[PDB]
């Protein structure tokens with residue numbers, strides 16, 4: 150029993166974290182085989198950030214201007230190139246701890262684990278979700294750029310996020326490992342903001358199934374709804390629309406608990422319209438939306454890596 | 455910015471997890487140097503659990519009745535002994551991935567990371583706190599026994615908890631790494647309900663200081679309180695008493711934000727009376743008590759967003 154915000158074990162990623170320094174800037178890099186990936190903004194002074202020409206900034210650098218430190222060992226940079234907003238530093242040593250991995254781009258609503266890092270040294274691990282507005286509600290201080298987000302599928306690390314910046318509301322923005330930003334953000338010092346966010350409906354339903362599995366049933370009711378009537382209510386409360394794909398994905402939880410997806414949607418509708426009336430669900434007074442249907446099934450089944 | 459329930463990176467502990475089997479029972483063990491530590495109940499059947507005589511069960515076992523698997527490698531058991539509620543299996547191979555470590559027994563209110571494991575393989579990592587009633591609100595299924603709790607302040611792993619059992623209320627009980635239970639629990643199937651739990655007051659105050667550091671002051675008020683009047687109120691809401699030690703420990707967070715400890719106690723008193731009136735603090739609609747003063751200092755910026 151119990152239900153916690155659980156991250157994947159981080160060991161396979163810890164063995165890839167290095168420190169990258171260019172001039173006065175130090176941030177983190179990810180060392181996989183003979184390449185170190187890091188945010189391309191490592192080559193900018195604060196004035197360059199106002200309007201950077203990364204190709205022009207980069208041509209002025211030699212391989213030796215990039216100092217890469219893996220633990221207490223200095224790695225030798227033997228090549229450099231840019232792919233979108235990521236810099237790829239070819240090194241003369243393949244990482245002996247390179248795990249089996251893939252670079253995957255995730256969709257809003259998907260969750261992942263973040264290994265927060267400073268000076269190439271992992272400091273913490275936590276779970277978060279890619280918001281519908283493409284930001285993440287992370288916990289990051291200056292020096293955390295280059296920290297990565299990942300999932301583990303079987304024995305393979307799927308890297309999905311590299312940290313680049315903090316927005317004025319204290320939320321975070323970054324790229325996939327191919328350097329494509331999530332959201333309409335750019336890697337420069339200019340006016341940027343998180344857009345209005347919404348709640349991830351399919352995840353709230355998954356967490357209500359987790360609560361039923363753990364014995365929290367007070368919110369269940371005799372009613373059902375249609376998908377169209379439920380979506381009219383979701384829009385009213387700034388919840389994402391629920392699709393037939395979301396319904397299909399929640400099928401197993403509907404079968405295990407005897408609570409059809411549209412029957413749980415009727416419970417969610419009543420929770421939105423009336424509140425919790427002093428009660429909590431899995432120790433929360435808010436409806437939690439950072440657990441996917443897969444996260445619920447995994448935590449309630451004990452899948453290992 | 456931001457404030458998350460953050461665990462320590464689990465890599466150093468993942469390299470120590472093994473599977474221990476005795477007859478039909480398999481659970482997890484922790485392999486450090488040439489010893490594997492695991493719950494002594496690995497030698498029991500379910501029927502043995504009403505009144506097990508561990509000394510009598512153990513004397514009937516040889517070294518070769520214990521099977522230990524580290525990855526895809528079978529380790530050889532060359533000695534065994536029981537220390538309190540833990541079994542220590544001496545093996546013929548020192549763990550090459552043994553980190554720098556210590557065994558530490560923690561007090562209620564302290565937090566630690568749990569690496570949940572099944573069949574010697576890690577499944578996930580999360581943060582939790584030793585409750586005032588000596589239980590932990592973990593997430594554990596059958597087969598998770600032997601999973602450990604730890605902190606890693608400054609590269610040394612401090613192991614503080616080994617998982618033994620789930621109580622009827624769905625909360626968890628276990629031991630330190632010397633096999634001494636936290637709380638009045640025994641590794642026996644018997645009536646042993648946890649005491650009524652309370653809220654860890656010093657941690658709620660630390661988390662209110664985290665909120666101020668991160669830029670939020672809505673919950674503050676113009677008042678102060680004495681320590682005794684605060685305790686009289688707080689005990690009415692099932693909050694733990696705040697001691698002078700707790701006040702001393704909050705000194706650094708008080709200096710960073712400019713809010714006296716007893717002035718923050720007055721804010722907590724008011725929140726307990728009023729609720730949040732539709733507002734949240736660090737993304738929560740409840741008062742959070744599983745972040746210690748040390749955790750807040752570790753995670754938060756040293757510069758308050760004024």
Ligand SMILES: CC(=O)Nc1ccc(NC(=O)CN2Cc3ccc(Cl)cc3[C@H](C(=O)Nc3cncc4ccccc34)C2)cc1
Pocket residue numbers: 190198289290291292293294313314315316317318319335336337338455
């Ligand atoms: C309320 C408010 O105004 N807050 C605030 C004010 C200023 C900043 N940023 C800076 O001072 C300089 N940064 C500019 C910048 C531009 C573009 C790109 Cl791609 C990266 C970066 C860097 C950056 O954002 N790094 C960071 C990343 N994560 C967490 C941080 C936490 C604090 C400071 C930096 C962090 C550097 C952030 C937040």
Ligand SMILES: CC(=O)Nc1ccc(NC(=O)CN2Cc3ccc(Cl)cc3[C@H](C(=O)Nc3cncc4ccccc34)C2)cc1
Pocket residue numbers: 150495503594595596597598599618619620621622623624640641642643
């Ligand atoms: C809500 C509710 O009723 N929960 C619940 C449901 C079942 C049980 N226990 C058992 O079925 C068999 N266990 C008996 C037992 C006796 C004494 C000692 Cl020292 C250990 C053990 C084992 C044990 O507690 N292992 C476990 C550990 N952690 C998490 C578990 C989660 C489910 C099942 C086992 C777990 C084995 C306990 C609690």
Ligand SMILES: [Cl-]
Pocket residue numbers: 559560561564
């Ligand atoms: Cl302690």
Ligand SMILES: [Cl-]
Pocket residue numbers: 621622644645646647648
């Ligand atoms: Cl009991």
Ligand SMILES: [Cl-]
Pocket residue numbers: 709710711712758
């Ligand atoms: Cl101040």
